[PDB]
């Protein structure tokens, strides 16, 4: 599924991401825009044997199990295929876990490169929440 901006914002709000560990909702929407273009099915297959999965491009070395990645930790305790669902809950639950496991949003390169220091409130402006 390819989400709309405001639709994704509302779904993320319902799942408790606004102000999760001090990150406002617009940060999360921005991260999804630049990681995946809002596409729940996005994959990126890396040359190191890992793959980034879903709307938040969560990587298979530390976070989910795809069976094919060396050094797998599976810290979200999920198959990576769960991150490719139209429902965002598994991605949100794992994203929370990433921050809880002592990462900031710096875990997402696209956030650090394309959202950090920008007006992220723009990404929820005009939306019904």
Curated annotation (Swiss-Prot):
InterPro entries (alphabetical): Glyco_hydro_22, Glyco_hydro_22_CS, Glyco_hydro_22_lys, Lysozyme-like_dom_sf
Main localization, broad class: secreted
Catalyzed reactions per annotation: Hydrolysis of (1->4)-beta-linkages between N-acetylmuramic acid and N-acetyl-D-glucosamine residues in a peptidoglycan and between N-acetyl-D-glucosamine residues in chitodextrins
Gene Ontology terms for molecular function: beta-N-acetylglucosaminidase activity; identical protein binding; lysozyme activity
Keyword Hydrolase (UniProt): yes
Annotated function: Lysozymes have primarily a bacteriolytic function; those in tissues and body fluids are associated with the monocyte-macrophage system and enhance the activity of immunoagents. Has bacteriolytic activity against M.luteus.
List of catalytic residues: 35, 52
Keyword terms: Allergen, Antimicrobial, Bacteriolytic enzyme, Disulfide bond, Glycosidase, Hydrolase, Secreted, Signal
Family, as annotated: Belongs to the glycosyl hydrolase 22 family.
Any single biological process term in GO: defense response to Gram-negative bacterium
Residue ranges of domain C-type lysozyme in the record: 1-129
PANTHER family referenced in this protein's UniProt entry, alphabetically: LYSOZYME C (PTHR11407:SF28)
Binding site for substrate: 101
Domain of life assignment: Eukaryota
Protein name as catalogued: Lysozyme C
Disulfide cysteine pairs (residue numbers): 6-127, 30-115, 64-80, 76-94
SMART domains attached to this UniProt entry: LYZ1
EC number of the protein: 3.2.1.17
Organism annotation: Gallus gallus
Subcellular location: Secreted
Pfam families to which the protein is assigned, alphabetical: Lys
A single Gene Ontology CC term: extracellular space
Any further remark recorded for this protein: Lysozyme C is capable of both hydrolysis and transglycosylation; it also shows a slight esterase activity. It acts rapidly on both peptide-substituted and unsubstituted peptidoglycan, and slowly on chitin oligosaccharides.
């Amino acid at each position: 599924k390819v989400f709309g901006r405001c639709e994704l914002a509302a779904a993320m709000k319902r799942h408790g991401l606004d102000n999760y560990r001090g990150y406002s909702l617009g940060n999360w929407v921005c991260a999804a825009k630049f990681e995946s273009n809002f596409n729940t099915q996005a994959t990126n297959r890396n040359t190191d044997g890992s793959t980034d999965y879903g709307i938040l491009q969560i990587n298979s070395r530390w976070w989910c199990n795809d069976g094919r990645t060396p050094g797998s930790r599976n810290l979200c305790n999920i198959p990576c295929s769960a991150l490719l669902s139209s429902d965002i809950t598994a991605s949100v639950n794992c994203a929370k876990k990433i921050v809880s496991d002592g990462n900031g949003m710096n875990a997402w390169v696209a956030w650090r490169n394309r959202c950090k220091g920008t007006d992220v409130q723009a990404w929820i402006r005009g939306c019904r929440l």
